[PDB]
C-alpha cells in the first residue's frame, strides 16, 4: 500500500493542546470546582465519578474561554495574553473545538447514558446563549433585561447546570437542584458584568471596561441604555468598540449618571435573597445544612 | 420569582442557524450523499437509519465549511460569499459549533449504543487533522508527503469514515469498509488540492489558486517546495499569503517547472488503482458488483 | 502696527474652490436646470432673477455632492474620482461648506426680504433629511417606508423646493407649486435608488450597487429587508459595507427574490400618476399646458 | 395621496443635535461670552438682543469645533472624546453643518437686515481661514508668518468679529471696534498656538502637542521651521502626523533649540501692547474706562 | 575554544542572493549590454576586461532594481512580482546592498588602479540622484525641469557613465565619451518617464501609470504641474499615491490637456539631435562609423 | 547644449545626509572608538591615519543603524525616534547606502591598496551576517547556537574586524589581532542580546524587549526555544512581532523559567576568560601590558 496510517503521537497531541495548555497554566479563581464541592455536600457523588465531572467542567470552561476570547476579540485573559495572541486565532479555535470533544470522550467514562443526553442538551444551550449575545451585539440592538437573563441562563448557567446535572445523574436522590444552580449562574454573570466595569482587579485581568471594547450588551449597560433612549451616546460607544480609555472612562461616567450600578447591585441583592430562600427550602425538606454553598454565594457577591 | 425561564423559539433557532442555512441554500455537489448511496449498495442500511446518517453527515459537512472558511480566511465558497463575510466571523463560528451538537443530537435518534463513540472518534480525528495542518501553516514548516497524507486521512477522511462507520453500525454485515473509504478520502483531497490550482471551475468557485492565498501546504505545493529546497520562492510566497493574482500565477508557473502536477496525477493514478483493487477484493469475497462506487471514483478524479 | 490686513486674492479663491471647480468641470446631467426651466413656463420669473436662482441651485447642488460623497465614503462621482480622493476629505468638506455661504451671498442679489428665510428653511430641511438617513445607517435600524419618504422629501426634495420657492418669491402669480415639486423630488430619489442597483449607466458612474457599499437604507433595500424579517442576510450585508462585487451581486440577487424592484416600479407608477393628476389640476385651474414638465417626469423615470 | 408629509418631532431634533449637545455638555472656558460682556460695557446692547448674539456665537463656536475636530482628525476635545469618536464623522459633520443654519435662523430674530450681511461675510471669512490652513497643511508648504496671521484673522478672528459686529449693528454708536477685536483674536490664537505645545493643562485637554499630530503650521512651528531651512526635521515630523509621544517630545525639544517659544512670547508681548494702546485710544475719545476687557486681555496672555 | 569560525557555503550564498537571482531569472531587455557593445566598437576593450565590466554593470543594475522597487513601493517588475513581494523588503534590501559589494569585488579583477575611484564616483552620483528624487517626492515640492535633468544625469546616467568610464579606463584611446553617454542616459530616462504613462507594453510590465502611484515627479508630470500652477489636481493626485485606475486615468487625461506629452516628444527630438551631432563629431575626428549606437539611439526613443 | 550639468552643492549634500546627520547628533556610547584606542596601544598607527579609520568606522556604524532600524522595523534608537520615522524609510535607506560609499571614498585617503580589499571583504561579511539573521527571522526557523555565532562574527564582529584590520594595514607589526577582536565582537553582541531583554537602560533606549517585537532569534531566545521544543509559546510570540508589553513580559517570564539568562551569563563568562587568556597570550610574546583593552572588556560585560 502507498499510504500507511500512523498512530497519533504525544508530540502531536502536545501541538493540538498548545493553546489549551497555555490557558490551564494561567492561574484562575477555580469557582466552578468550588461550586461542585458545595453541591456534593448534598449529592454525595463518589470520588471516582466526581473527579470525572470536575475534569469535564474544567475542560469545557477553558475551551469556551479560548473561543470567547476569539469571538469577543479580547486582549487579556487572567491578566495575561489571550491564547490566540500567541497561537493565532485558527489554532486556538481548533484547540478549543477539539477539547469540546475530548470532554465528550471523558463524559463517556461515566458509562451513564443519561450523562450523554445531558452533555448534548448543555452544549446546545451554551451555543444558544452565545448565539443570542452575538446577535444583539452585531445588530446593535439592545435587548430587554428579560431577554438578557434568558441568554445568560443558557450561556453562563449552561455550564453550571451541566456540572450539577451530571452529578444528579450520578446520584440517586430525587431532588431538582437545577433551578437553584441556574439562579447561581445568573447571579455570577450579573456580578461579573458589574465587576468588568468597576473592579480594579478586573481592570488588571481584562483591561479597563473591556465589555465596552467588545460591544457587549451587559447588564448595567442595558439598563443605562434603556433608562434614557433619547441619549444614544452609550449605545454608540458600544458600536465603536473603543480600545481607548478616554472613551471608556466617559462611558463608565455616563453609566454612573444613570444610576446603573445601584440598579445592578439592587438586582443582585434581590437574586441573592431568592437563592438563600431556595437553599433554605431544600434544607427544610430533608437536606442537611450546607455552609459551603452559602460561602460560594457570599464570595461571588462581594461587590469589589 | 424575578427570573422566569422562557422556551427556545423558532425565531431564535432561525437566528442561530442564519449562517448555516445560508451555506445550505448555496447549490453544492452533494458528493458525500453520492458516496453514502454507493456504499449502501453493500451495507443496505434501513431507510430510516440512512436518512438520519445522511442528515448527520450533511449538517457536519456544512458546519465544518463555516469553520474552515473562517480559519482559512477564505473569500468565496461555492462561487458565492463565504458565510462570515455576510454574518461576521463570530456568528459564523458559533453557528458551525452549534451545528456540531445539533448533529450529535440527531445521531442519538439511531439509538445505537456504539454511535456516540463513532461520532466522538471522528470529530476528534477531524480536529486532529485540521490541528496539524494549521500547525504546519502557522509555523511555515513544510511537512513530508507521508505526514500530509496522515493529516489528510484525519481531516478529509475523518468525515468520510464517520459516514461509513455509522452505516456499518446500523447494518447486519460485518465487512470493514473503512480502509477503502479512507483511501477514497485521501484521493478526494489530493484531487481537490490539484484542482484548486489548475481548474477553471475552481478558480470561479473559490478564486484563482486560493490555497496559496491561505498559505496551505497542499499536495502539489509540498512536492514543489521539496523538489528543490535551494530555491525558496514558493515557500516564501506562502508566507506572504498573497491575494494578488500576479504572485499566484508566478507560483503556479514555478510549480509547473518542478513538474509537480504530473507527480500529483501519477500519485492519484496509483491510489485509484489501489482503490479498484480493494473494491475488486471486496467483490471477489461476496459483495455484489458496485458500479456506483466506480462512478464516484471516476468522477472525483475526472480532471486528473 | 505689527499685523496689517491683506485683501482676499483671486489665487486664494482658486485654492478654496479647488474641489468645487473640479466637480463642476465633470460633465453632469444638469437636471435641476431642466426642472427650473419647466416651472418657469408657469412662474415666468424675470431673466436676471432666474439667472441668480439658477446659480444658487447649481452651487448648492455641487456643494452637497462634495459633502455627501465624503459622508458616504464614495469612490466615483459622475464616472470620475470623487473630489476628496483628489483633494482630501478636509479640503473637500471646507470647499463644500464654503460654497453654502457663497450661495447665500448670491441669494442676496435678489434683494427679496423673504429669500433668506426660504434659503434657511431649505438648508435646515436638507440637513434634517441627511441627519435621519445617517442615523438609520449608523444604527443599522431599518426605517419604515413612510419614514424613508419623509426623509427623502427633506433630503432630495429640500433642494428642489428651494428652487421653486425662490422662483415663486420672484414671480407675480400666487400658485403653490411646492407639493408638486416635493412629489417630483421623492420620485427622482426613488428612481435614483432603483437605478443605483439596476442600471449599467450607474454601475459605470458610481460603481456596481454602491448604496450597498455605503450601507444605505434605500427604497428597494428597505422593502427587501422588511418583506422577510426572518432572513437577515441583506441587513447584515449593509453592516459589512462591502466593496467586493461578489457580496453585492448576491445582495442584488436576494433583492430580486423578494420582488423588491417590481414593488419599486409599481410605487413609481403610482407616484407619477399623482404627479400627472396634480399637473393636470394646475392646468385646469388656469396655467397653460406644460409639455416640458411632462418630459422631465418621463425622463427621470425612463428606466422604470 | 400616497405620501403624507410629517412634522419634525423633538425626538428627531434630538438625534440631529446628538453630537452638538454632547459638546455643549462638556465644560469649557467660555471666553467668547466674556469677550461679548467686556465689549458691552461700551456698546450697551440690550439684554434681549445680546442674549440672541450670545446664543449665535456659542452655537457657531461648538459647530466649528465639531467640524475642526473631524477635519483635523483630533482625539480629544475639552479633555473628553471628540464627538465624532462617539457619533462617527458623518453624523458629527452633519450636526455641525446643521447648527450653522440653526444659528442663521437665530440671527434672523434680530430683524436686522445688516446682521444678515454680517453673518454671511463672517461665515465666508471663517471658511476662507480654514481653507488656507488646510491648503498649507496638505501641501506641506510652510507659510510665512504674515500669511499665517492673515489666515488666523479670518479663522479665529472671524468669529470674534462676528460677535462684535452683530453688537455694533444693534447699537447706534459710530465707533469701529473691529480692528481691536480682530487683534484680540490674533493674540488669542497665537496664545493658543503656544499653549498647545507648552501647557500641562492643554496636554490634559487635547494630548501632548496635538498640533504636531495634526500637521498644523502653527505660529511657533512656522518660526522654528523658517529659522533654519537647512534642517528639515521639524517639517518632516509634521508630514508624519505622529501620534507617538517620543516624536512629539523630540519636536518640542528641537523647537526650544530654535528659541521659537521666546520668539512667540515676545510677539504676544508686542501685540498686547498694541491692544492696550488701541483700548486707551478708544477711551481718550469718549468711551468710559473698561476694566473687563483689560482682564480678558490679561487672562488670554498668562503664558502658563 | 568555544567559538570556531566556519566557512561561507554555497547554500548560504544561495540564500543571500535569493532575491537577486529571482530578478535575473526574469526576462529583461539587457539594454546596457547593447550600449556597452556599441561603445566597444570605438573603445575596443579586450574581451576579458569587457566581460568583467559587463558582469559588474549587470549586477549593479539588478541590485538597484531590488532597492528602487522597495523605495518606490512598486508592485510589478518586468511584468512579474517585484522581489520584495516574494522575499520581503528586508531580504530584498540586503540582497541588493550585498550585491553592490560583490560587484566592487568583481571590479577589482580588472587590476586597474583607477577603477575603484570610478566605481566610488558612480555609486555616489547614483545615490545623489536618487536622494534628490526622494527629497522632492517626500516633500511634495515640484522640481524645475533643469533640476530634474541634473538629478536624472546622476540617477540614470550614473550607471551608464560607470560602464563607459570603466571601459575608457581599460582602453588605449583617450577620447572622452562621458558627455555623450550621460546625454544618452537623460534621453533613456525621459523616454522611460513618457512610456510609463503612455505605453501598453509598460502598463503590462509595471502597471498602468505607475509613476503616479509612486508619487514621482517625472518629466511629463513636472511639465503638466508647472504649466498651470493654479490648478492643483495633478500634484494633489501625486500626494494621494493612488493605486486606483480611475484616479490615474483622470491624471493621464489632465496631462494630455496641458499638452505635456507633445512637449516631452519635442524635448526628446531635441536631445536625440544633439546626440547625433555629438556622435557625428566624434566620427569626423577619427573614430569609425558606429551603426550600433545609432540603433540603440533609435530603439530607446522608438515609441517617441 | 540643452542640458548643462550642475555641481553638487552643500545644500544638496545636507539633504542626502539628513537622516545620517540626525543619528550622529543623538548621543551614543562610542564603544568602537574606545575599541580602536585600546588596540592602538599595540599597533601605534599615527594620528593622521587613525583619524581616518575612526571616521570610516563611525560612518559605517551609523549607516548600518539607519538600515537595520528600517529592516528591523524599530521605533527607538538611542532613546529617540528612529531616523526613518522622521525622514521616511526611503530617504533613510538611501542616506545610509550613500554613506557606505562616502566611507569607501574615505578609506581611499589611506592610499593603501590593502585597505580597499579589507573594506570590500568586510562589507561582504557584514551583509552576509544580516543576510542569515534575516533568513532565520523570516522563515521562523530557530538556528543553532553555533549558527548564531557564525552569523554574529560576520554581522557584529565584521565592523570590529574592519576597524582593527585597517589598523593592521597601517602598521608594520606582524601579529594577528583579528581572532581577539572577533571574539570581542561576539561577546559584545551576546551582551547586547542579554541587555535588550534585561536592562532598564535598554528599555529606555529601544523599548521593552524590542528583540521580541523584531522577531530576532537572539542568543537567550535561541537557548530558551531550544531548551524545550515541546513548548512553542516563545517561537510563536516571535512570529507575532508583538508591540504590546503584556506579551513581552510573558515571554521574558517564560525565558527566565528556562534559565536562559543564567545560561547566557555563563557563556559570556567563558568567552571573557578566553579573551583575557588571548590578551595575556599576545603580551607574553612581545606586546606591552594593555590596561585599556582590559577595561573595554570589563565595560561590555557588566551585566546590568
XYZ file of C-alpha atoms in Angstrom, chain C residues 1-6 8 12-13 15-16 67 70-72 87-91 93-95 97-98 100-102 104-105 108 113 116-117 119-121 123-132 134-139 145-146 149-151 153-154 182-183 186 219 263 267 270-271 274, chain D residues 1-6 8 12-13 15-16 67 70-73 87-91 93-95 97-98 100-102 104-105 108 113 116-117 119-121 123-132 134-139 145-146 149-150 153-154 182-183 186 219 263 267 270-271 274:
138
model
C 1.275 98.148 13.522
C 2.577 94.559 13.514
C -0.426 92.987 11.760
C -1.678 94.560 8.525
C -4.774 93.008 6.944
C -4.412 91.806 3.342
C -8.519 88.191 -0.439
C -6.734 82.165 -2.837
C -10.316 81.832 -4.102
C -7.476 77.324 -3.814
C -10.712 77.465 -1.790
C -20.158 66.773 1.344
C -17.476 62.409 1.961
C -20.149 61.217 4.401
C -20.946 58.228 2.142
C -8.019 66.955 -2.635
C -8.537 65.051 0.651
C -11.622 64.993 2.823
C -10.820 68.154 4.805
C -10.400 70.470 1.794
C -15.524 69.429 3.157
C -14.396 73.029 3.603
C -14.871 73.740 -0.095
C -19.241 74.287 3.352
C -17.692 77.480 1.952
C -23.033 77.004 1.076
C -22.290 80.591 2.134
C -21.103 81.887 -1.271
C -26.261 82.567 0.500
C -24.415 85.670 -0.734
C -28.917 88.255 -1.527
C -36.974 90.198 2.039
C -33.231 84.472 3.330
C -35.937 82.596 5.226
C -32.858 79.565 1.970
C -32.631 78.865 5.736
C -35.746 76.666 5.699
C -30.824 74.188 4.216
C -32.416 73.129 7.503
C -34.666 70.536 5.853
C -31.701 69.341 3.768
C -29.691 68.678 6.896
C -32.728 67.176 8.603
C -33.071 64.727 5.745
C -29.430 63.723 5.713
C -29.384 63.651 9.509
C -32.078 60.975 9.730
C -27.183 58.845 8.687
C -28.970 57.967 11.932
C -30.589 54.894 10.396
C -27.380 53.875 8.615
C -25.144 54.284 11.668
C -27.612 52.471 13.918
C -41.087 53.195 4.000
C -43.217 56.016 5.411
C -40.270 59.083 2.199
C -40.422 61.763 4.918
C -36.605 61.761 4.997
C -38.819 64.741 0.998
C -36.367 66.692 3.141
C -41.693 67.717 -3.454
C -43.553 64.829 -5.063
C -39.490 61.869 -3.975
C -36.249 52.286 -1.153
C -42.502 46.867 -5.933
C -44.674 52.726 -6.442
C -48.423 55.309 -8.573
C -46.424 58.463 -7.753
C -50.394 61.534 -8.778
C -52.234 60.836 -1.682
C -49.583 58.085 -1.339
C -47.137 60.344 0.542
C -48.339 62.262 3.632
C -45.684 64.669 4.950
C -44.948 64.505 8.692
C -40.432 67.454 12.518
C -35.757 63.761 15.637
C -34.290 67.129 16.546
C -30.972 62.930 17.011
C -29.730 65.706 14.701
C -16.066 70.148 12.189
C -13.168 65.982 12.098
C -11.012 67.923 9.614
C -8.045 67.918 11.995
C -8.631 64.239 12.927
C -21.248 59.545 16.741
C -18.945 58.923 13.754
C -17.574 61.610 11.447
C -20.703 61.685 9.263
C -23.376 62.496 11.843
C -20.230 66.749 10.392
C -23.932 66.943 9.557
C -24.877 68.045 13.077
C -23.335 71.937 9.384
C -26.957 71.838 10.578
C -24.586 76.672 11.139
C -28.064 77.265 9.703
C -29.841 76.976 13.048
C -28.590 81.736 10.842
C -32.249 81.276 11.769
C -32.873 86.394 11.856
C -31.007 93.369 7.722
C -27.583 89.021 7.838
C -24.866 90.513 5.633
C -23.240 86.679 9.298
C -22.698 85.885 5.603
C -19.491 87.903 5.394
C -19.028 82.651 7.586
C -17.307 83.418 4.318
C -14.216 84.616 6.184
C -14.132 81.686 8.604
C -14.213 79.208 5.755
C -11.506 81.207 3.981
C -9.298 80.895 7.047
C -9.667 77.136 7.421
C -9.294 76.939 3.645
C -5.775 78.406 3.726
C -5.756 73.213 5.209
C -4.060 74.227 1.945
C -0.660 74.690 3.622
C -1.034 71.572 5.779
C -1.911 69.266 2.909
C 0.735 70.714 0.581
C 4.315 84.455 9.455
C 2.428 87.248 7.657
C -1.769 85.922 10.621
C -3.923 86.750 7.612
C -7.589 86.879 11.363
C -10.130 85.091 9.126
C -9.500 91.217 15.315
C -6.218 91.913 17.104
C -4.949 87.005 16.680
C 2.938 80.064 14.968
C 10.053 84.422 19.886
C 5.435 88.673 19.664
C 4.229 93.376 21.245
C 0.605 92.586 20.244
C -0.808 97.388 20.638
